[PDB]
């Protein structure tokens, strides 16, 4: 086995060809950004989730 796959079809692991050691692959940190605003009428201050 060369490259693993999870319950979905994404690749979660790969075998190092040169060192024959297994590496878990995790896609780099990501997410959604939500902006909490009191209203531009009130203030321009925001919070970030």
């Amino acid at each position: 086995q060369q490259f693993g796959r999870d319950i979905a079809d994404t690749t979660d692991a790969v075998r190092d060809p040169q060192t024959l050691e297994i590496l878990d692959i995790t896609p780099c940190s990501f997410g959604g950004v939500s902006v909490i605003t009191p209203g531009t009428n009130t203030s321009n201050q925001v919070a970030v989730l």
């Binding site: 999870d6 319950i7 979905a8 994404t10 979660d12």
Partner: peptide, 29 residues
Amino acid sequence: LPDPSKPSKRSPIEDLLFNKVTRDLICAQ
């Protein structure tokens, strides 16, 4: 009635209801 001893503070019936209803799937999605 809520059960104070248990941390969730749920009733026994509520705890049974919560137990019955149920790379991870969530992680992949």
